[PDB]
Design a protein around this ligand. Structure first.
Ligand SMILES: *[C@@H]1O[C@H](CO)[C@@H](O)[C@H](O)[C@H]1NC(C)=O
Lengths: 36, 47
């Protein structure tokens, strides 16, 4: 996944939206969710 | 919260501070003026 912060490898990108869990930067957050 | 489509505020007028959908970034007129007034350096883009 390519983001304004940089290259994020190992995380699946989704078009949903939730509360920030792990802030990455430039409006992108990562979280552990669902098989997880 | 979202402002109602009809701006019937008893004569009071807030267009210059409410968002302008025309702009790609939904900022108000005064917000655009403020953003242009600052000559920011080192924004922090991908580059
Ligand atoms: C997720 O983003 C939008 C949602 O409407 C749409 O293109 C599609 O459902 C999904 N696209 C990708 C690349 O995930």
């Amino acid at each position: 996944f390519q983001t304004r912060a940089g290259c994020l490898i190992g995380a699946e990108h989704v078009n949903n939206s939730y509360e920030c869990d792990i802030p990455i930067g430039a409006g992108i957050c990562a979280s552990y969710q669902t098989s997880q | 919260y979202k402002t109602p489509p009809i701006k019937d505020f008893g004569g009071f007028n807030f267009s210059q501070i409410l968002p302008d959908p025309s702009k790609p970034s939904k900022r108000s007129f005064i917000e655009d003026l403020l953003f242009n007034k600052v000559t920011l350096a080192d924004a922090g883009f991908i580059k």
